[PDB]
Amino acid sequence: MQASQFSAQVLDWYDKYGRKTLPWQIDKTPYKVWLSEVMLQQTQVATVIPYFERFMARFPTVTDLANAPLDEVLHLWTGLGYYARARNLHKAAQQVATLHGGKFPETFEEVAALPGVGRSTAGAILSLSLGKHFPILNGNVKRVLARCYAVSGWPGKKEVENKLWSLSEQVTPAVGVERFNQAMMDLGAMICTRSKPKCSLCPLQNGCIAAANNSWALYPGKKPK
């Protein structure tokens, strides 16, 4: 299926079945999306919700986070694991306070220059909060695209990662980008799961190569040897 059909199908799915109501999806701002995405990167949504709420209550703005002692941040993080994320979160908040006047930056380069924020997270922050036209490529999205398009290789190989970014760019619209990127993450989290994907529930099932061949276990490739 052509890229414009992929987009349309994902957006139609999101409208009827998507996750739209989580706390970081209401009255979205760059700060809220960044905080949530950092929390979500290594933690499931159900675990994250109470931490996001406690963080937003304690730190309503990025300057509040910046000005807090690191030990208080780490205390509030306790139980999320992967504390390098918290150390970077705090440093990034301080960079936003120091370099950007306390206003979370709204341009890609400046977002991507923050500690703890890579190309995909920067694209997520600006597409979800502001509708800027950037694609994403987290683990979940890699799996959806690798299955749909039979990307056999290990995404730890630069050439393979680049192929996946190209595919993501190709399917990602400008109109509705906030909805499409959330939908792709939702699909990878809840439908196109690591094991035994729920293809009958997937809006891509009519063009996905893995579904056609029952070969989801091949994609993405795993690390060699």
Add this chain to the structure above:
Amino acid sequence: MQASQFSAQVLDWYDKYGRKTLPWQIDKTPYKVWLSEVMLQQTQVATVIPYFERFMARFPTVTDLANAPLDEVLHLWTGLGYYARARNLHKAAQQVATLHGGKFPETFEEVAALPGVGRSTAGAILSLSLGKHFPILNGNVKRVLARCYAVSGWPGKKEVENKLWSLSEQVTPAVGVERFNQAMMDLGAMICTRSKPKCSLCPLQNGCIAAANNSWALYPGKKPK
């Protein structure tokens, strides 16, 4: 453990781990709580969220629901199953429009007189939306209380149902009732599950008889013969 300790433990749990952010939990009103509770009674939360959102968008008030054609209600219900709920929902909305001026009633008798609303649902509507001091007793709550208190009998027997209502009354506080009743429903849905309850995650584990005896399978009793 004494009833006041049961309450306190449930409320402390809810504060750190409870579900607080679902759409029917924000800017709560009697109408929103009633709609959500009817949807939730035979359908899981993940399935309900998009239907609740579509209903609230199409029917912002109970008079809007009342004045709509039944066939439109049933069309929007499609996929939730158990359509007697939808038929009663519509009749109840019409009763609220006709008898109560379009303002969802805020007193127990008038709520409990609505089609599709029993004693527990009426108590849920008024406790969650307004903080009125009523206990609840749905299937999930029956299971939590029957396990904690070793209620061996089948809740289809009046005497057993009455015992469970008495226990619910005993543990239900006035202060924080909205939080306690949501928490009890959350516990029964996610922790004290029908099979293999997650007792190590449960705030009642230090006084629950079933946990002490590893005897959760006995409670509540199942229907005889």
